[PDB]
Amino acid sequence: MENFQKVEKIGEGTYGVVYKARNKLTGEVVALKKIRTEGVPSTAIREISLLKELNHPNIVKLLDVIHTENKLYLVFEFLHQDLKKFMDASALTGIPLPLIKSYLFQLLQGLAFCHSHRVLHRDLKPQNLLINTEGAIKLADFGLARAFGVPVRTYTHEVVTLWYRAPEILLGCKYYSTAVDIWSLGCIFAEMVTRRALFPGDSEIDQLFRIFRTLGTPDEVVWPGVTSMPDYKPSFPKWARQDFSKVVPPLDEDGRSLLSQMLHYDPNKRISAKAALAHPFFQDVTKPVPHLRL
Template identity: 50%
Template sequence: MEKYEILETIGYGSFGCVYKAHKRDTNEIVALKMIYSIDGDEGVPSSVIREVSYLKEMDHSNIIRLLDVLDDDQILCLVLEYMDLDLKKFMITSADIAKKNQVIKSLMHQLLDGLAYCHSQKLLHRDLKPQNLLIDCSKHILKLADFGSAREISVPLQTYTEGEKVASLWYKAPELLLGGQKYSTPVDIWSAGCVFAELVIQQPLFDGATDFVQVIKVFSIMGKPNEETWPGVTSICDFLDSFASSEPQNLAEVVPGLEPAGLDLLSKMLCMNPEGRITASEALGHPYFDDIENP
């Protein structure tokens, strides 16, 4: 740790703090993610072990880089490349971003590019949200971060442990909200679609307080699914026939200001049936990105 001079606190995580720091020998600015809960019989949290192992294996311009891992008695420190803000703070400080279609288009292209890489490496992120997407403000570069909830994709699909942390509530795919334990890459696409809509309207698209309320909010906009639109949905453990029937709303009214090609892409990302959801690699080839600047 003597190699680094801590400059300021930039965030708080589940197990510790994140600091902006200066590396003394190279003058490089880095982020130090401190993990404090390493004592007794607990050991290193499994989410940290996963994050370190996954980041060590990944090499992509839209994935945060792990530069080093320091182990100092009761503290484990991940040395990461420094980014200015997370996407949530970027949206707050750039209040007019909704008017900058090319900025939104570039950010979404980078998000999907990083996600396509993860999926090609057989990895689910499982917690995409604005707070886990980091921004270099001067260059509008976006990078996926926080892989503590990530999991390897298995074929055939495995049954994941009930109660595992999978996606933050407002960005959780309907198959997860309904209690599904077999899922794959479409859960990340749904989360990315929620981020897409939030960039445009500057507020979360679905903001329920509980899983049940979140389901109702999703159904109220996207329509209540049935066996015709989503085969097998009524067999998912938490699906209730008593859910109020609802028809899909016009996305152009729900997400005003988004061009027709963007609305088409968003509708494909927020397809209720996970089997019908567009993939990240397919999304990169969508006409919405035809006029993107510096892809």
């Protein structure tokens, strides 16, 4: 990197390698992502470029989109840890409820902002949620999925996780709505509470069936139009819905109520980020600081 001294390899993203780097001129420390074949789609350039204006305190800031030497680099503000690592590290005692609530509240503010500007994430997961020592949490990679697509395998053959995928996506819908992000966030909220992934599928059908086994196989009553979806099969087994009290114990009724609205099958009935922010669950929200050992 000409203007960047590579500090460390942060990981192998969905699109390419990500490095923590230091701008040799300003000294600012950033996250530099090298995106993957030959020519760089011009449409992706314009689209990604527009994201430079999508600024909000709970959205990882896109500092620059470098299209030089016919290669694509994205420069992002740097945060020291992601939620996946934090959850793993908090697995023995669990993340305290006040912090889970603060993070969920901040994540919803972030979604509310992007959604009002017509930008969707589409692939939210704990690894895409970044946190700092101040108690803030931010969403990373908003809008990139649209600029590219679903790779199935990152770039190093790693398997892309399906655990947070909305059911309308699994059923073949071609047009995603903002509801897909609320679904993923609901799945993450449940994982923070129980300390185990809600729907850890290892194939598209296993993912769909794990959802059906917990929330019941969807039908025309709860989801008008579901039986006409591209990948819907009348042969899907019919499972009864389980009670949330059994799905995310020992979360209280305000939390179960909100989660239930974030996991509604019908994308149109699923709660919006804006409405979720007004839910009684956030009546006593605060902003605690996490125990972060960097």
